[PDB]
Scaffold this active site. Structure first.
Site, PDB file in Angstrom:
ATOM      1  N   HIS A   1       4.668 -10.034   5.448  1.00  0.00           N
ATOM      2  CA  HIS A   1       3.488  -9.320   5.910  1.00  0.00           C
ATOM      3  C   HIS A   1       2.308 -10.267   5.960  1.00  0.00           C
ATOM      4  CE1 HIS A   1       1.558  -9.059   1.843  1.00  0.00           C
ATOM      5  NE2 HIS A   1       2.789  -9.025   1.375  1.00  0.00           N
TER       6      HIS A   1
ATOM      7  N   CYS B   1       4.859 -10.036  -2.379  1.00  0.00           N
ATOM      8  CA  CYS B   1       5.876 -10.384  -1.403  1.00  0.00           C
ATOM      9  C   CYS B   1       5.320 -11.283  -0.315  1.00  0.00           C
ATOM     10  CB  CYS B   1       6.484  -9.109  -0.819  1.00  0.00           C
ATOM     11  SG  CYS B   1       5.260  -7.840  -0.414  1.00  0.00           S
TER      12      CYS B   1
END
Length: 169
Positions: free
Chosen positions: A126, A142
């Protein structure tokens, strides 16, 4: 029939974990794999409905932990490489061979104009609104990228594209 993306179970996997991991339904994962309900099998290939075949895809992505980078290749041949961030959650797998399950275009928040979801919940590519965390190793977060870069991959590669989480060196 369609060319979809398979999963090979590990000893003691869960149906609802894989449906959390691939952001799918267990009802659809049971729909694709009636064997799961009954029980699980290590090494059992179970397919992911709505998610196509990575080997029909012309691109490949290599995530280097040891470098905090994201390689965008075309036919195995590198096109580009974007800086990314890795949380201590990716450090677990020294092979980390995973696949983009689906994408979420601009949520609106700091999630970096996109959230491209991976075959593992925490394994995910992301963007961010704090770019100076990019290229860095973070406690848990993440694999973050930059907005224009996470939109690149989002336009260039389709779902199913394999994101290889390599510890590297």
């Amino acid at each position: 029939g369609r060319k979809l993306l398979t999963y090979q179970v590990k000893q003691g996997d869960t149906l609802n974990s894989i449906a959390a991991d691939f952001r799918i339904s267990t009802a659809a994962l049971l729909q694709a794999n009636p064997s799961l309900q009954a029980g699980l099998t290590a090494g059992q290939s179970i397919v992911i409905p709505g998610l196509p075949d990575p080997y029909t895809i012309p691109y490949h992505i290599a995530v280097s932990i040891g470098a905090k980078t994201l390689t965008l290749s075309l036919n195995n041949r590198v096109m580009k490489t974007y800086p990314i961030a890795v949380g201590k959650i990716l450090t677990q797998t020294p092979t980390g061979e995973f696949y983009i399950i689906n994408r979420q275009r601009n949520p609106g928040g700091p999630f970096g104009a996109y959230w491209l979801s991976l075959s593992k919940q925490h394994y995910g590519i992301h963007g961010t609104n704090n770019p100076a965390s990019i290229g860095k190793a973070v406690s848990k977060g993440c694999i973050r990228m930059h907005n224009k870069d996470v939109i690149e991959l989002a336009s260039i590669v389709p779902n199913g594209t394999r994101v290889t989480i390599n510890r590297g060196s």
